[PDB]
């Protein structure tokens, strides 16, 4: 996260760290959506241009974390993966369309002050809140600048951007399964996701029921925190029928 701040304790209790078993290293962010299900970006698990194709036994998830590198004894919980599910129309060839994946845990994680699931949006919460200028919150342990790494989880609040501005900022083909967020050069304020924040959540606090909803997944950007560029996020509601199909079937 570029130009963010240290998270408060328990501020993002749905935060999940995707962790490589060997060598031991952070791979991505992710989010807890129930006691058995974790949501992430498909490119965190499958990206052939970078020779990335993880299997379940390659990975762990670490839940309840604050420190990036410490083993947070008596606080964090470490879970093995039962199964990975990648969206069947995830487009790793062109533009990361439908950049979404689910991971089922081998055993349910116990909720605590530090571990708690985020809500997924319904159609109405998505329609109300996914509007240009409305701000969401992005969290992660990724790089602090494009060209370095944080001690603890970082947080930044960013406004959703008008779709024509998102489209006009890039040569990548944008789809309805994406939205973009970040400040404009004239707005003064800054902030972005960066490498290592992939797969983490873009959340909004509904003013109707005071619950946090995950509206996006950290997906892609060209650089980090560049003027005139924006971060792009998987549109969770647009892909929720697939999420529900997977969870209902498995």
């Amino acid at each position: 996260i570029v130009e963010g701040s240290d998270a408060e304790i328990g501020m993002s209790p749905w935060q999940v760290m995707l962790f490589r078993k060997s060598p031991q290293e952070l791979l991505c962010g992710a989010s807890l959506i129930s006691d058995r299900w974790v949501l992430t970006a498909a490119h965190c698990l499958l990206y052939p241009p970078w020779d990335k194709n993880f299997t379940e036994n390659d990975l762990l998830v670490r839940i309840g974390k604050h420190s990036r590198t410490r083993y947070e004894r008596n606080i964090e919980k470490i879970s093995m993966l039962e199964k990975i599910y990648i969206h069947p129309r995830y487009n790793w060839r062109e533009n990361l369309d439908r950049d979404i994946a689910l991971m089922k845990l081998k055993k349910p994680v116990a909720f605590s002050d530090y571990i708690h699931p985020v809500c997924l949006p319904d159609r109405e919460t998505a329609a109300s809140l996914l509007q240009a200028g409305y701000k969401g919150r992005v969290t992660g342990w990724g790089n602090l600048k494009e060209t370095g790494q944080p001690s603890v989880l970082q947080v930044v609040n960013l406004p959703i951007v008008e779709r024509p501005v998102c489209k006009d900022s890039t040569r990548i083909r944008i789809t309805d399964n994406m939205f973009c967020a970040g400040y404009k050069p004239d707005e003064g304020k800054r902030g972005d996701a960066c490498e290592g924040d992939s797969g983490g959540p873009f959340v909004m606090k509904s003013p109707f029921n005071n619950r946090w909803y995950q509206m996006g997944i950290v997906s892609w950007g060209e650089g980090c925190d560049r003027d005139g560029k924006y971060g792009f996020y998987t549109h969770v509601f647009r892909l929720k029928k697939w999420i529900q199909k997977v969870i209902d079937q498995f």
């Binding site: 962790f19 060997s22 031991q24 290293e25 952070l26 762990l60 670490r62 590198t69 083993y71 470490i78």
Partner: peptide, 11 residues
């Protein structure tokens, strides 16, 4: 870098 995690999670 990263503090070693308990070996139980790596078995």
């Amino acid at each position: 870098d990263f503090e070693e995690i308990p070996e139980e999670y790596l078995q």
